[model samples]
Target: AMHQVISATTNPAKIQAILQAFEEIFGEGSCHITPVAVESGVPEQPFGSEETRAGARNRVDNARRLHPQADFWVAIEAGIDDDATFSWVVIDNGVQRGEARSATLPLPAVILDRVRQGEALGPVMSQYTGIDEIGRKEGAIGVFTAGKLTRSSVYYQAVILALSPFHNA
Candidate 1:
């Protein structure tokens, strides 16, 4: 059977993660991930876990609404609390929904305070590190982990966890 999965972001990093994770979980050729740049309708950078998860859910809901033909929808969001990063993942197929959080990791104070000051992590990270499109590119996780772990890989793990219900079935 063919499953059309819609991913909420056009960011290559996130899209790659979702596609790879889906392929790994559902088997390649069985599923196809569509990257449709959809509006989360939340702040550019969500602050806390609750806010972030809401944004992620909003994405899934919006995707399902905008692309009713899709078999599944996915949303991966990253938030900051003090100095730690909180990643939230959501998967929905209308009747079934699954959500999970990635491990929180502490970040440098410079990045933390800037985010606290109402700055989006992506541009802030770019300014703080002089790397362009940090969020769409390597992301803070990649920079912090020195490229061994990436934003995609971090979210990839979360997606894997989010698909737990489907795996058990």
Candidate 2:
């Protein structure tokens, strides 16, 4: 029998979403999923591409270091890039270890310019949708529900990239 796997992540939304996806694909009770807090050494700032990947790597490395006997290690890095692109990348380093899987979407040049000018996306999106916090807005679902270009949409894409080939393998 396959041993229970552990997922390392800090974001509650990401942990819940991943567990839901895993159970959907692997069947309930087929696997044990544990969400643990692991520190990623990356600092919060510009959220550059390299920093993003490094953060993921740090999470995996930290989990392995902290729990040497863990059956699996999963890391997710989500951030907004200077290009006004909000994305999420998954890095799995365990029995099926390899490079990180990422999903990206390009925002309009207008939005990109806004980011370049040092504006944070969360506030901008809230303003655009007339919501106080885009994260808590139902419109956030619509951003992805329509399969349009949005962070949530990219999240699903990233999940597929991380889990699909692993299932095949």
Candidate 3:
């Protein structure tokens, strides 16, 4: 029997990106991708590490409940930490129970101070680059070109690299 593959996400851009990436890897239409919107029960507030973990777990559990028949399910959550320093973390969970993969990109001390002083990452990066929404400023390439790291590349790489360990264990 052939295994079925599915992709789920609430974000349209994410869905598109994932599908594109999948096509690049497994050839076009090799896997069936499904996008599902999950109501994250997490409150709209800054989350600590534990809360972030809970949120990721909750999302995966909810998605699993909704799509019990799916052979595979993926849940991704992006969380921000505002403790002594500001950092963005990404968590990915799937059907196989194991340690969820996560990646953290710490804001530079200068950037952290700015955030603490009420400067959001978007505006700060925009002003620094003289462009709006740093994502478009250089896409993934621009991120490295600007001498600033990006959460997207870091997060995606970490998740993919960690998959083997999770799958094997």
Best of the two (2, 3) by TM-score: 2
Q: List candidate 2 stretches off by more than 4 Å.
A: 1-3, 45-47, 80-88, 98-100, 109-114, 117-120, 127-133, 136-153
Output the lDDT of residue 18, model 1: 87
Candidate 1 C-alpha lDDT tens digits along 1-169: 7899999888898888888888998887888888888888987668788998999999999999899988889988888765798778999987889999987879788777878888888888898889999998888888889899988888888899999877785
lDDT tens string, model 3, 1-169?
3223333355543444445544444466665667777655875223466675566566657766777766555545544574332222222334344334444545567656665665555566676657766643333233434645443444444344434443453
Which portions of model 3 miss their true places by more than 4 Å?
1-8, 12-30, 44-46, 82-95, 109-150
Query: Model 2 residue 15 lDDT?
Result: 60
Error of 3 at 64 (Å): 1.9
lDDT of 2: 0.59
Instruction: Select the stronger candidate by TM-score from 1 and 3.
Output: 1
Q: Candidate 2: lDDT of 133?
A: 64
Question: Which candidate tops lDDT?
Answer: 1
lDDT of each: 0.86, 0.59, 0.49
Summarize candidate 2's per-residue lDDT along 1-169 as a digit string, tens digits: 6545566765555565556556666787675667778888765423687777777777778888877776667676755565534434454536565444455545567656666676766566677667776653332444535535433444545665667656773
